[PDB]
Write a protein that binds this DNA or RNA. Structure first.
Ligand code: MG
Ligand code: MG
Ligand code: MG
Ligand code: MG
Ligand code: MG
Ligand code: MG
Ligand code: MG
Ligand code: MG
Ligand code: MG
Ligand code: MG
Ligand code: MG
Ligand code: MG
Ligand code: MG
Ligand code: MG
Ligand code: MG
Length: 74
RNA sequence: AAGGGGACCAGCCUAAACCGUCCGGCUUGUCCGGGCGGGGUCGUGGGGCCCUCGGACCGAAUCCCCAGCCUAGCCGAAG
């Protein structure tokens, strides 16, 4: 049962990682405790749409820095 | 059971793709979901989306009117 970790978890994986666990662990532990959500298609693109923003909104923190590394060093 | 002979005869709407809008959520958006509207309905497969071209007949099982019919009756030959 693939689920999306919402927290860095011991020997399981990092936050945002999609790992496989037994169903009982998912519905009776990981899911009612907020530690993860199930890897449905519905909130699978939710994950792709956040890695997207961060990928863009981080490289923008890089593109603007250069727009001054070129100015000031000159 | 197929097949043959007959009775009757009639075919339709939708889900999904893709658009639009509204509302919700807080994993902030090219986000997810819920509505509603548009789209669409097929087996030679069909539909969606993008290119070129071509630009009125059909018609309900729904509604209206009417005939007809039903719920009383009536005329009716000649000792
Ligand atoms: Mg047979
Ligand atoms: Mg027959
Ligand atoms: Mg919608
Ligand atoms: Mg619809
Ligand atoms: Mg429609
Ligand atoms: Mg249609
Ligand atoms: Mg239609
Ligand atoms: Mg329709
Ligand atoms: Mg048809
Ligand atoms: Mg065939
Ligand atoms: Mg096709
Ligand atoms: Mg008919
Ligand atoms: Mg009909
Ligand atoms: Mg009489
Ligand atoms: Mg008499």
């Amino acid at each position: 049962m693939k689920v999306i970790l919402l927290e860095p978890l011991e020997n399981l994986g990092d936050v945002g990682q999609v790992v496989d666990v037994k169903p009982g662990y998912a519905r009776n532990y990981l899911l009612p405790r907020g530690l993860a959500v199930l890897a449905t298609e519905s909130n699978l693109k939710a994950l792709e749409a956040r890695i997207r923003a961060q990928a863009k909104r981080l490289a923008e923190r890089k593109a603007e820095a250069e727009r001054l590394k070129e100015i000031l060093e000159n």
